[PDB]
Amino acid sequence: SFETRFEKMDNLLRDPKSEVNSDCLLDGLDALVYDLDFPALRKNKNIDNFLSRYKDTINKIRDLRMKAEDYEVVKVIGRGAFGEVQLVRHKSTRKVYAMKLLSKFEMIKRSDSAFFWEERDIMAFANSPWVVQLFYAFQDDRYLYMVMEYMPGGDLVNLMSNYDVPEKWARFYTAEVVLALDAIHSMGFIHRDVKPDNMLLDKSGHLKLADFGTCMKMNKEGMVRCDTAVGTPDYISPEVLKSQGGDGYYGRECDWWSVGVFLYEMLVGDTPFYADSLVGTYSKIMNHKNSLTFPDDNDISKEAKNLICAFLTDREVRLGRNGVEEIKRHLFFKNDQWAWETLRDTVAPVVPDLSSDIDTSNFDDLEEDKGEEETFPIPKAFVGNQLPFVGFTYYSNRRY
Amino acid sequence: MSFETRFEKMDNLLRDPKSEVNSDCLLDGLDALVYDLDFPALRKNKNIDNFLSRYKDTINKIRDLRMKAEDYEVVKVIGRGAFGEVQLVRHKSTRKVYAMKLLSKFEMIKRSDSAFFWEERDIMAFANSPWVVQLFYAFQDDRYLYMVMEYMPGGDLVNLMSNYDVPEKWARFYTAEVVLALDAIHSMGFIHRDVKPDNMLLDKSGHLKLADFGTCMKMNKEGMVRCDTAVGTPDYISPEVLKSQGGDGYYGRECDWWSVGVFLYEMLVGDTPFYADSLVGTYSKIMNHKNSLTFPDDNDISKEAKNLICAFLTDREVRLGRNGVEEIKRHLFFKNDQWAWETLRDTVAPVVPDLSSDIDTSNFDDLEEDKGEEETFPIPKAFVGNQLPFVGFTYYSN
Numbered sequence A: 001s002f003e004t005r006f007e008k009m010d011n012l013l014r015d016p017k018s019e020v021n022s023d024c025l026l027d028g029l030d031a032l033v034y035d036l037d038f039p040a041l042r043k044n045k046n047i048d049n050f051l052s053r054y055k056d057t058i059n060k061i062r063d064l065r066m067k068a069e070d071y072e073v074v075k076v077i078g079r080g081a082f083g084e085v086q087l088v089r090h091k092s093t094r095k096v097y098a099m100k101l102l103s104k105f106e107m108i109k110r111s112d113s114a115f116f117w118e119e120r121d122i123m124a125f126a127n128s129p130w131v132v133q134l135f136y137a138f139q140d141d142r143y144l145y146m147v148m149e150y151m152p153g154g155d156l157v158n159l160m161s162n163y164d165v166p167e168k169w170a171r172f173y174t175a176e177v178v179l180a181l182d183a184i185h186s187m188g189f190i191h192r193d194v195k196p197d198n199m200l201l202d203k204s205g206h207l208k209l210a211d212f213g214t215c216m217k218m219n220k221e222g223m224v225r226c227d228t229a230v231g232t233p234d235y236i237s238p239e240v241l242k243s244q245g246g247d248g249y250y251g252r253e254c255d256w257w258s259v260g261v262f263l264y265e266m267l268v269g270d271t272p273f274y275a276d277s278l279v280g281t282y283s284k285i286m287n288h289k290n291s292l293t294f295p296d297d298n299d300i301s302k303e304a305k306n307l308i309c310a311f312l313t314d315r316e317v318r319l320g321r322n323g324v325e326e327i328k329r330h331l332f333f334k335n336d337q338w339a340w341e342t343l344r345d346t347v348a349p350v351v352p353d354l355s356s357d358i359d360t361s362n363f364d365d366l367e368e369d370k371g372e373e374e375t376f377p378i379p380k381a382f383v384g385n386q387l388p389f390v391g392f393t394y395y396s397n398r399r400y
Numbered sequence B: 001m002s003f004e005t006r007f008e009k010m011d012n013l014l015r016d017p018k019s020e021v022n023s024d025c026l027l028d029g030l031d032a033l034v035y036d037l038d039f040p041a042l043r044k045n046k047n048i049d050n051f052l053s054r055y056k057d058t059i060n061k062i063r064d065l066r067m068k069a070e071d072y073e074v075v076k077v078i079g080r081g082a083f084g085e086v087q088l089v090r091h092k093s094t095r096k097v098y099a100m101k102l103l104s105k106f107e108m109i110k111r112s113d114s115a116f117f118w119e120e121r122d123i124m125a126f127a128n129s130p131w132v133v134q135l136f137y138a139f140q141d142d143r144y145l146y147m148v149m150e151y152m153p154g155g156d157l158v159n160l161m162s163n164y165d166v167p168e169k170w171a172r173f174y175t176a177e178v179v180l181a182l183d184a185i186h187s188m189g190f191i192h193r194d195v196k197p198d199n200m201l202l203d204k205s206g207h208l209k210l211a212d213f214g215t216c217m218k219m220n221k222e223g224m225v226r227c228d229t230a231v232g233t234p235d236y237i238s239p240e241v242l243k244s245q246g247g248d249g250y251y252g253r254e255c256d257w258w259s260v261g262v263f264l265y266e267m268l269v270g271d272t273p274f275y276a277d278s279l280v281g282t283y284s285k286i287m288n289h290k291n292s293l294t295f296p297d298d299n300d301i302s303k304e305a306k307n308l309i310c311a312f313l314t315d316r317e318v319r320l321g322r323n324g325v326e327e328i329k330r331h332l333f334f335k336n337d338q339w340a341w342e343t344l345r346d347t348v349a350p351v352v353p354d355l356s357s358d359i360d361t362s363n364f365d366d367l368e369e370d371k372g373e374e375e376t377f378p379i380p381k382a383f384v385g386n387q388l389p390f391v392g393f394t395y396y397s398n
């Protein structure tokens, strides 16, 4: 019909998940103008006319869309591999966020993933108390921007470094991680990178999973086919570490192995497979059968040792293989202060004491500025470097 | 300005029909970029190959839902333009009848002329005047631009002048309707620059509308325009525009009234006042208008008609219409006892067309057969950009 078509079209223009909604269409034009405004291409008639035809229109567009100078930087609080994360306040709304930056030139310069899509999709739609929420995402010719909620409590690395964690606490944080990963699994994802660095606490002291740069979608059988290893040297599982072209076909059990490494560190004080070098940890992990030993100290309860061992073993025997419910039924979690279905409603072991909306005490000092980072080379001919990052924007068509 | 304001100002721009960043214009820019990149030589670049591979399923579906050419059923060819034919069509779904104009993209690029359609698209779409032919829809593909307009069943004034010896009473009516039609186009801020019977069409009631505006321009601060172009049909073109060969000339809107004087002269005498065999001879007679403008040895033309034709066919600085349009209306030639200006298009027309159906094309002569195969674009080796001058043309109505 003539109306059914006009309707179907209006869906693809509004739906927050359309490949061509207002966010994607306003980006596509913004990408073209950016990737044409070079004197070596201005010699072409069509390009020179097009840029002069849209010059006044495109400068009005960029002044109205969300841009970097809309935010007031307060302090740098994190360093990612591709860009820093800074505590900012929106100049107009006065609201405080944690803004993440991603250098476009850097990611294009050999980072075989285009990973930002998976993290943008989860943090924006997950709608879970265990997942850090993405509020806005925008871009320009240099960086990608991810405006997320600020976690004032800090990461679990900072907590472990300033405390000797007792079992009561370890039980709480391990249980909150288990529910956090089960929520990510329900979305159809294997995390592949579970570690304290990616765990942050809110203003109440409860745990959330920040960063999802290594998340991948499971198939119908619930497995993942990968030819290259992914993760962190200490927390990586035996099957993900030996990932090769011969197969490389693992399930979600690898995530629970990392939770066992996480529990071991909170009690013992060190990683279960520490070494003098980095490549030593590798041999120690592949030989987990004989290398996994607890130090001579009576303070690790029988149950704690049992769970850590139930996680740190071969995939086929490893606990958590028959669903997440057999992990929750474990005796280590058997306590008398909370229940699973009401855990994030109970009072946290360490409640943070904050002075203001911008209290950054739980975050160690960084440097700021660094000068100016070099970006893409000025094109001689049409390169089209913004085409990969088209439609990353999350502003005009957000889900409410 | 607040954040709630900045967000909403942006959101309104995607629905505003006058906006250059409206939803249809943004959809054009993506539709275009896929055409001007999908060549096996440019697939070597991965940023392009990856961009095209993502929007495959998507851009194919977009080009399927939007208004396309096969949505209309062609009934008969009724007109021919420089860049493509104009055909009477019926929309297959709504069953409504329109006159659709076609413009070959490749042709406009080849002739180095792809910046005139904007002025006509803007007027016919927003003019909202009984004197202006209305544009309902405008869409495109990789080959032509499309302009869906209201069909004028009355035919052009050329066909009327060829089948009748136009009496003064009629000439008075049609000249007055042109004067009001041009005054409406002037109020929008435009000088027409191309007033002739070919561009005048009658509706089903027999009243005049200006169709085709492919040479209109926006007037500057003093209400004038500086331009430099060639000459197409110099029979109606004024002295000032002819002296503007280069861009050294600044002319006002009084050039449009000169053409109205040529229009009145033709309706009565029977021929153009400065006609010649060659194109350079027509020009020479226009420049020497003080001596070439004459009248036949038959006093069929009244005193008033002679006066008005002379008041229009003189130097710009003395030409009638310089001191506004009101001094033209006050002229004694128009002094009649049939109508008044403010109610003219409500009176009965001198020639009311007799129609048989919604597709009666009797007032339009049959048109040959173009037959000439349209040439296509050669496969690029770099970025050519043969779609950028045609982004933002698509337009829908409510």
Ligand SMILES: Cc1cncc2cccc(S(=O)(=O)N3CCCNC[C@@H]3C)c12
Residues within 6 Å of the ligand: A077, A078, A079, A080, A081, A085, A098, A100, A132, A148, A149, A150, A151, A152, A155, A197, A198, A199, A200, A210, A211
């Ligand atoms: C400090 C911080 C504070 N508040 C919210 C955050 C949301 C995502 C990431 C961070 S972050 O910790 O800056 N961050 C990115 C740097 C790489 N290391 C992983 C880690 C999760 C936040």
Ligand SMILES: Cc1cncc2cccc(S(=O)(=O)N3CCCNC[C@@H]3C)c12
Residues within 6 Å of the ligand: B078, B079, B080, B081, B082, B086, B099, B133, B149, B150, B151, B152, B153, B156, B198, B199, B200, B201, B211, B212, B364
């Ligand atoms: C026949 C016709 C019939 N109905 C509506 C029309 C609207 C615009 C142009 C035409 S048209 O006359 O086809 N036309 C274009 C060809 C060049 N000459 C100018 C003239 C106005 C219409």
